[PDB]
């Protein structure tokens with residue numbers, strides 16, 4: 001009963017990004033018997049501590065844990081310090097625990113898909129980096145990245161291949177394909193097509209099979 | 216001869232948004248014999264003058280026109296003052312000229328589609344308005360709009376129906392459907408689906424037929 005009750009984690013602290021991560025984080029380790037108890041606090045705090053910021057995410061979440069996590073720490077508190085330290089590839093903190101892996105996947109899946117396509121441009125909005133045609137002709141020029149549409153084939157399109165969770169990869173594979181199709185429509189529209197999608201960008205930015213013949 | 220040469224409009228002034236608008240603005244009035252000469256300057260300056268801003272876009276573009284447009288003004292200069300004044304529904308300047316209509320469509324199509332889906336979130340980025348789940352449960356709550364994802368069914372999803380150009384509407388209809396499908400994937404992902412799309416949002420935010428049976 002301390003499986004649903006402890007939801008009163010940030011549900012009494014002081015954000016929704018976590019609500020979802022847990023949701024898909026559970027689906028990743030469904031019926032594997034790993035530790036769906038630590039992984040939780042892992043994905044529930046990885047942000048409470050803002051390339052130096054993840055190593056402190058645990059040197060921060062550990063001290064703060066000694067407040068409400070007072071009831072049940074045990075050995076399950078050193079694992080909540082690797083997960084919440086190995087999720088953002090800003091610190092390159094390689095995840096070793098099979099629990100610290102499920103999070104580095106659930107949170108990293110928040111970079112792809114519909115929400116992912118929204119983050120790239122929202123962020124790119126404040127930072128004001130643009131994303132216009134200044135990026136299409138990059139078939140012959142070079143990627144300056146954060147031109148948001150470039151951030152696409154620099155991090156995002158390369159995220160699924162470096163996915164370290166069995167299912168999480170095939171999942172970060174579909175969502176990563178949703179981004180390409182967006183690129184497909186963006187190319188056309190960008191080439192005054194207004195209708196179809198550039199069936200040439202789908203051919204280069206996403207592994208066929210995810211939609212296909214066999215020779 | 217003075218149809219391609221005059222491209223040296225902003226090509227020597229002091230932005231790419233125009234390059235495209237003309238492209239699709241020509242396709243809208245293809246073989247109709249209207250005035251593919253004024254419509255051009257129309258879509259080439261509607262921005263040089265930043266709900267009061269469109270009426271001045273012409274009270275500004277007219278004076279500036281008296282510089283390079285010195286060679287060929289004629290009656291074709293009073294039309295370049297209605298178009299470049301009737302394109303943004305911020306001034307509600309109803310377009311009367313069939314030329315001032317092709318622009319209010321070509322420029323308004325830049326709100327839908329792939330580029331459209333990027334603008335909503337980019338802009339929403341600087342203004343920092345968010346767009347998270349705080350918008351999904353709005354099936355029972357109310358839309359505060361600029362929550363970017365709301366800006367969707369408030370302006371964008373209503374743009375194609377108020378389109379005033381023969382073809383331009385069926386065109387702003389497809390691109391407007393591309394936005395819904397995005398909403399479709401956003402719903403699923405938002406509901407921890409990670410795979411398909413909420414085939415319930417496609418059912419409510421876009422007129423079937425654009426993809427369908429017949430009873």
Ligand code: NI
Nearest residue numbers: 017046047107
């Ligand atoms: Ni995160």
Ligand code: NI
Nearest residue numbers: 170171174410
């Ligand atoms: Ni699959």
Ligand code: NI
Nearest residue numbers: 209212213214
């Ligand atoms: Ni097959």
Ligand code: NI
Nearest residue numbers: 232261262322
């Ligand atoms: Ni504009």
Ligand code: NI
Nearest residue numbers: 195385386389
């Ligand atoms: Ni059609």
Ligand code: NI
Nearest residue numbers: 424427428429
């Ligand atoms: Ni039919």
